[PDB]
Design a protein around this motif. Structure first.
Motif, PDB file in Angstrom:
ATOM      1  N   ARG D  62      65.335  44.646  68.427  1.00 30.94           N
ATOM      2  CA  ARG D  62      66.531  44.961  67.663  1.00 30.94           C
ATOM      3  C   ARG D  62      67.313  43.673  67.408  1.00 30.94           C
ATOM      4  O   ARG D  62      67.568  43.324  66.259  1.00 30.94           O
ATOM      5  CB  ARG D  62      67.376  45.980  68.418  1.00 30.94           C
ATOM      6  N   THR D 136      70.586  47.635  70.468  1.00 32.59           N
ATOM      7  CA  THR D 136      69.786  48.844  70.309  1.00 32.59           C
ATOM      8  C   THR D 136      70.144  49.468  68.956  1.00 32.59           C
ATOM      9  O   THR D 136      71.265  49.278  68.471  1.00 32.59           O
ATOM     10  CB  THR D 136      69.759  49.758  71.542  1.00 32.59           C
ATOM     11  N   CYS D 140      73.491  49.070  75.616  1.00 29.63           N
ATOM     12  CA  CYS D 140      73.190  48.222  74.471  1.00 29.63           C
ATOM     13  C   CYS D 140      74.069  48.589  73.283  1.00 29.63           C
ATOM     14  O   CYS D 140      73.920  49.635  72.645  1.00 29.63           O
ATOM     15  CB  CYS D 140      71.733  48.285  74.019  1.00 29.63           C
TER      16      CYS D 140
END
Lengths: 234, 439, 60, 234
Positions: D62, D136, D140
């Motif tokens: 990501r 993410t 996160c």
């Protein structure tokens, strides 16, 4: 009159450093020309008066001794420098005052001894770090011998100064770097060694402090270290 | 060297209440940023477990209930849920990760529950034992929520004097209970002359004193250490320290001594990284801990073995504060006694030992030197509701424990249990069964 | 100092700068900034502690 | 052509720092006049290119992020300086190369973000030290948000540079010290924060390294610290 000497974060007051003795009348300095000679030069904070824990001189005190650099194998920075570095070499001003009242007769001899091999053997045995080692009058090397079966009376050859209490109460030896090499491993080899012996036995008046303190103020001078710096090329 | 003085050694906190373990260090337990103190909870017969570290954060293998405190010398523990498993000695340290530890004695937190009655289960003597002239009248006092569990054996309508050696067990983590299995050993002619050998148990459960009389006519990182070692006076006594990973910890393979009648103490920390170690000032000349650069192993040897140096050595190769490690704690003994094989004697479960809903059918592993008598059940198959009793000490320096495996009264004909009494010291394998007697 | 005219000694006065922790041993303090003030030589050690603060105005 | 930059014990090779961007076109410098301003100046060894552990960019990577100074809360010296000192302030040259073969299409955006408050709270949570923190796509923080519920497409305001693989394979942000103060506690307050997000998803040819490495080379520049130095007077 009292001079107040400073070395960054540390300051010492001194009555009169008139009786200062530089061993062999050689002032300590760096390595002269005689970068390529890898003179890593950190003469910044490792050059500050440190102060060892004071010993208590008494009637039956035989004597004390400290190896240098050893002593400072912990005095913060300098002690550090003797690890991140393989090689080094420092002189030192040792400044021994022992404040006592006008009613304490007594006299100490401070002896700087190059390569002071104290005889009677195991690293730790001969390196009392910062608390120094003491003598004995019969482990503890024999006092009037300084380990080595010598007659005390000859000590005076070695850079020395006598703290006769009924006069000056301080003493300042100034050792320059001395060794069979030009630089060396500051850790496993103690260039000097300061021994303090009582010549006239400490005596005083009836009800008076029966154990005058003596402090050592070792300030490493013009010190330097080896090099990690390598070199690259295109 | 930051110290610790864990006050209030004895403390009993029952379930539903709140426990505590205060700390009082002579020197500060924090310098850089975070604290070096912690909150532990170690049970009896265990290794250096991970409960908490840094006095604020929690270590692996713990719950969220255990909070943190003590951002200085004055620290403590936290528990908002007490139970039977809460019975563990707490001792706050004064080190986060560095190899310079010196913790206090200990501040234990015991547990309690509603008082119960201690039923008397007296068994008869074995045949193989009686033949040798080692007739012992056993009596168990398990399933009781009271520490005081006495067992005074009688002989010919008179309580025995200087003819018994009872041993109380630990606090069972089920419903805050305990156990105590005593035995009244005597000679062949002595037991034959005596008509009956009863034993009463007047604990803090029942009003009167209950007994059971019977006639003597019809009735991240890890390190798996080695086992215990035996040696003589002025001999060698080391310990194995091998890991089951890539290597050891970063700082070094530290060690923590655990002797009899003590909590914990640091001895010396030997590294497996390069070669340099670091020990304490007290321990000198008996902490020869080296490093084996063959299969990533460390050492914990000690020359000139004494009664003091005799401790279970290991290595808790912990890198971080959360993910820690421990050892098996290989015991290193030093005494003057000859080894002997543990002979298992079969003790039948009679109606006298039965309580209407039980039948204690266990074995007796008596006459075993170099204390190592672990009585399992069916080669270590089932172990629920049963607790292991502590081995007693004799004048000769031998050990004779009493393990009673509880069973069903009716189930004494169809199935059969076999308790394997092993001893690595003498290295003698034996697994005697326990059949039922008609009487 | 306001003791005997005949009395004598040396005291170490140390400035532990903020953020850190006050020193608890003489040794630690000698490593820090510190005057070694001889009772016997000068009856008074003076010493200006310096100004510091991120937030260039200390909050009372 | 490859330049070989040096900062004492450390050396980095760089293709061509032609695409170097100084955030807000302000080069970092010390505190100007506007000793008495206690500018303890140790611009010696704390000013050497450090190298964080490389991350492995993959297909489904990501993004990554590091707070500064935080990152260097361990990189030897500098990390030290952020403890013996109460106050400090450093700029930084961040140098992100990510060597890949000519057969890896892909593109990263490096964003320097002053006061990068990553939303969704406990010190340790927001300070991943030297290994950085990751994003993410749904702890996160959300990637296309950078924690803060912002639309990615606007990131480009914050000093940024795009590593489009089919072109330059390196990037060098130069952050100057930025803050509401003139100096500050380097420890409990992360002036900057570098986030690296993949704009074009990493794709490559059949049998080729399926996880190209990206290294960060953070060199603190013109850094300085508070003072312990007091003052005496006769």
């Amino acid at each position: 009159r009292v001079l107040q000497l400073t070395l960054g974060n540390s300051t010492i007051t001194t009555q009169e450093a008139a009786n200062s003795v530089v061993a062999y009348g050689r002032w300590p300095e760096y390595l002269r020309d005689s970068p390529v000679d890898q003179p890593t030069e950190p003469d910044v904070a490792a050059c500050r008066f440190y102060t060892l824990d004071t010993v208590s001189w008494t009637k039956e005190s035989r004597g004390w001794w400290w190896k240098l650099p050893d002593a400072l194998r912990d005095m913060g920075l300098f002690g550090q420098n003797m690890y991140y570095h393989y090689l080094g070499r420092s002189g030192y001003t040792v400044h021994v005052q022992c404040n006592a009242s006008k009613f304490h007769q007594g006299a100490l001899g401070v002896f700087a001894v190059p390569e002071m091999c104290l005889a009677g053997t195991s690293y730790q045995n001969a390196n009392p770090g910062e608390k120094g080692g003491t003598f004995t009058g019969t482990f503890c090397p024999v006092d009037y011998l300084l380990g080595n079966g010598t007659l005390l009376g000859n000590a005076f050859v070695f850079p020395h100064q006598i703290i006769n209490l009924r006069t000056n109460n301080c003493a300042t030896l100034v050792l320059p770097y001395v060794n069979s090499l030009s630089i060396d491993s500051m850790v496993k080899h103690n260039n000097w060694g300061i021994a303090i012996l009582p010549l006239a036995p400490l005596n005083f008046a009836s009800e008076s402090s029966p154990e005058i303190p003596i402090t050592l103020t070792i300030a490493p001078m013009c010190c330097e270290f080896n090099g990690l710096r390598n070199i690259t090329l295109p | 060297x930051x110290x610790x003085x864990x006050x209030x050694x004895x403390x009993x906190x029952x379930x539903x209440x709140x426990x505590x373990x205060x700390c009082x260090x002579x020197x500060x337990x924090x310098x850089x940023x975070x604290x070096x103190x912690x909150x532990x909870x170690x049970x009896x017969x265990x290794x250096x477990x991970x409960x908490x570290x840094x006095x604020x954060x929690x270590x692996x293998x713990x719950x969220x209930x255990x909070x943190x405190x003590x951002x200085x010398x004055x620290x403590x523990x936290x528990x908002x849920x007490x139970x039977x498993x809460x019975x563990x000695x707490x001792x706050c340290x004064x080190x986060x990760x560095x190899x310079x530890x010196x913790x206090x004695x200990x501040x234990x937190x015991x547990x309690x529950x509603x008082x119960x009655x201690x039923x008397x289960x007296x068994x008869x003597x074995x045949x193989x034992x009686x033949x040798x002239x080692x007739x012992x009248x056993x009596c168990x006092x398990x399933x009781x929520x009271x520490x005081x569990x006495x067992x005074x054996x009688x002989x010919x309508x008179x309580x025995x004097x200087x003819x018994x050696x009872x041993x109380x067990x630990x606090x069972x983590x089920x419903x805050x209970x305990x156990x105590x299995x005593x035995x009244x050993x005597x000679x062949x002619x002595x037991x034959x002359x005596x008509x009956x050998x009863x034993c009463x148990x007047x604990x803090x459960x029942x009003x009167x004193x209950x007994x059971x009389x019977x006639x003597x006519x019809x009735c991240x990182x890890x390190x798996x250490x080695x086992x215990x070692x035996x040696x003589x006076x002025x001999x060698x006594x080391x310990x194995x320290c091998x890991x089951x990973x890539x290597x050891x910890x970063x700082x070094x393979x530290x060690x923590x001594x655990x002797x009899x009648x003590x909590x914990x103490x640091x001895x010396x920390x030997x590294x497996x990284x390069x070669x340099x170690x670091x020990x304490x000032x007290x321990x000198x000349x008996x902490x020869x801990x080296x490093x084996x650069x063959x299969x990533x192993x460390x050492x914990x040897x000690x020359x000139x073995x004494x009664x003091x140096x005799x401790x279970x050595x290991x290595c808790x190769x912990x890198x971080x504060x959360x993910x820690x490690x421990x050892x098996x704690x290989x015991x290193x003994x030093x005494x003057x006694x000859x080894x002997x094989x543990x002979x298992x004697x079969x003790x039948x479960x009679x109606x006298x030992x039965x309580x209407x809903x039980x039948x204690x059918x266990x074995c007796x592993x008596x006459x075993x030197x170099x204390x190592x008598x672990x009585x399992x059940x069916x080669x270590x198959x089932x172990x629920x509701x049963x607790x292991x009793x502590x081995x007693x000490x004799x004048x000769x320096x031998x050990x004779x424990x009493x393990x009673x495996x509880x069973x069903x009264x009716x189930x004494x004909x169809x199935x059969x249990x076999x308790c394997x009494x092993x001893x690595x010291x003498x290295x003698x394998x034996x697994x005697x069964x326990x059949x039922x007697x008609x009487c | 100092f306001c003791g005997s005219m005949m009395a004598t000694g040396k005291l170490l006065v140390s400035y532990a700068p903020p953020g850190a922790d006050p020193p608890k041993k003489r040794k630690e303090a000698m490593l820090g900034t510190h005057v070694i003030w001889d009772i016997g030589l000068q009856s008074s050690c003076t010493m200006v502690v310096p100004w510091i603060s991120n937030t260039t105005y200390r909050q009372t």
